[PDB]
């Protein structure tokens, strides 16, 4: 144990001594990019023709990406 406490009755206060510091004086930036492992619709029919998981799952994404493209200006 490094850290200790002193109590001063003169001022009725207590100090907590024994800390080492790091004072932030600037920023370091980095540009991370990432790519989409894209799915190509597979053409053929499933058990239920009225169900296109792959298309909807992309429109779920596409439309999400679109909603973010609207926040930058």
């Amino acid at each position: 144990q490094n850290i200790t406490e002193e109590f001063y009755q003169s001022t009725c206060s207590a100090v907590s001594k024994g800390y080492l510091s790091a004072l932030r004086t600037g920023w370091y930036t980095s540009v991370i990019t990432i790519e989409l492992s894209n799915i190509k619709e597979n053409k053929c029919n499933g058990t239920d023709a009225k169900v296109k998981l792959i298309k909807q799952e992309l429109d779920k994404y596409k439309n999400a990406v679109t909603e973010l493209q609207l926040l930058m200006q």
């Binding site: 490094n2 003169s10 001022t11 100090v15 790091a22 004072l23």
Partner: protein
């Protein structure tokens, strides 16, 4: 302790504590003389107006 002087971070948000190691943001810190340390011992220390 900054170089020579004393930095004072008054909001509890801007200072992170881990173990025995503090990380503070200097964005809004105050810079005081090392003589503020004499305020803890005497409130009417004539070398600094506490």
């Amino acid at each position: 302790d900054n170089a020579g002087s004393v930095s004072f971070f008054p909001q509890a948000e801007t200072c992170k504590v881990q173990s025995n190691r503090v990380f503070c943001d200097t964005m809004n810190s105050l810079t005081l003389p090392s003589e503020v340390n004499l305020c803890n011992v005497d409130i009417f220390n004539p070398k600094y107006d506490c």
